[PDB]
Amino acid sequence: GLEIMIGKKKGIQGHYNSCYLDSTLFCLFAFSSVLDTVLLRPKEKNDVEYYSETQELLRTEIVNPLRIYGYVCATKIMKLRKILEKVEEKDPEEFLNILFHHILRVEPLLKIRSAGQKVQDCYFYQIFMEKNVGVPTIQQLLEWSFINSNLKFAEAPSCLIIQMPRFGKDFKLFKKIFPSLELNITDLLEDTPRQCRICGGLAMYECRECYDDPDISAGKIKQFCKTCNTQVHLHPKRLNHKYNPVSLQNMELFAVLCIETSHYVAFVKYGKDDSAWLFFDSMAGFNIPQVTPCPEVGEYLKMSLEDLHSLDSRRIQGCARRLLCDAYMCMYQSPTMSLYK
């Protein structure tokens, strides 16, 4: 399978300032059908004059080739670059927005709302930290962000792209973060059977005021069925908690867009095996791309959080370090979405 994708002269070909495409495009289509529908979608009366060209190009000269040979000409990456300008310090974000939102007119992959407010569409989510006591997990982090900002997914995403926290005055500074091999969003989705914490029933009530209570499943979001809700709030301390009704399916990590100095690289996943990892260096008169195997980013990946905390990030592999310490985006999807059945 991935035999035609691995080695030198493999992947998307780099050209000067191309990496912010090479990488993200490699991510979104290397081994993943998540967006293949944007590829097939017929044009409709309200599309743009270069909708079609940008579809043929992307599918025909870029995605089809990369999938079938494992290589792509930086010349085709350049044909797209041109188009972009018609509509157009470039970033993966700016890139998605323009191609998907502006040209191709893809339904926003993320549907989000806070507290009976207007529903917010978007193509990726930016998670934010705030001072906390170990090495973080995307689970934790995603959850704390949805809490602090008071949000839920209206419908579940098939594609979830998560921007990592940038700590520079505005950006350009990262931490040591754990990219959860899987993502559980049940308790973050709207109309979905949530499990009452105590008995393991069907939760009818979530309460924010409870998150800060260490004595009931510390750190977990707090939700209880009707019966377990009544007890919890007959405790003198919780008499006032303004709990509310919760209204009346796991995502897999398939790609870690990373950032080094000014240069983006990509980790993609090529099989459910823990070790099933490939590194892809874009610029690895012309550059030579390299999709190299990456079983190392797995041995470290089965190491306890506060271990990853004690270990010196500098003293670790030339793969792992990057994915752990330099993660830029992490993408997730329905486990039904790899390019292998």
How far is C-alpha 184 from the chain's CA centre?
13
Pick from 88, 121, 209, 299: which binds Zn ion (CB under 5 A)?
Answer: 209
**218, exposed or middle or buried, with CB in 10 Å at 0-12, 13-18, 19+?**
exposed
Residue among 244 and 249 whose Cβ is closer to Zn ion: 244
Residue among 173 and 199 whose Cβ is closer to Zn ion: 199
Residue among 33 and 223 whose Cβ is closer to Zn ion: 223
Q: How far apart are the C-alpha atoms of 53 and 71, rounded to whole Å?
A: 21
Pick from 196, 251, 291, 323: which binds Zn ion (CB under 5 A)?
Answer: 196
Annotate 291-326 with b (16+ C-beta within 10 A) or e (fewer). Answer: beebebbbebbebeeeebeebeeeebeebbbbbbbb
Annotation says 263 is catalytic: yes
Q: How far apart are the C-alpha atoms of 155 and 192, rounded to whole Å?
A: 10
15 is annotated as contributing to ligand binding: no
Q: Which one of 22-30, 121-129, 162-170, 224-232 is the stretch in contact with Zn ion (CB under 5 A)?
A: 224-232
Q: Which one of 37-45, 75-83, 201-209, 291-299 is the stretch in contact with Zn ion (CB under 5 A)?
A: 201-209
From the candidates 101, 102, 263, 309, give the one annotated as an active-site residue: 263
Residue among 142 and 210 whose Cβ is closer to Zn ion: 210
112 binds Zn ion per the rule CB under 5 A? no
Annotate 247-266 with b (16+ C-beta within 10 A) or e (fewer). Answer: eeeebbbbbbbbbeeeebbb
Pick from 189, 225, 327, 331: which binds Zn ion (CB under 5 A)?
Answer: 225
210 binds Zn ion per the rule CB under 5 A? yes
207 binds Zn ion per the rule CB under 5 A? yes
Annotation says 319 is catalytic: no
Record the tokens describing residue 125, joined without a space: 């989510």
27 is annotated as contributing to ligand binding: no
* 2 to 123, 208, 331: CA distances (angstroms): 28, 46, 20
The residues that touch Zn ion, with contacts defined as CB under 5 A, are 196, 198-199, 201, 207, 209-210, 225, 228, 241
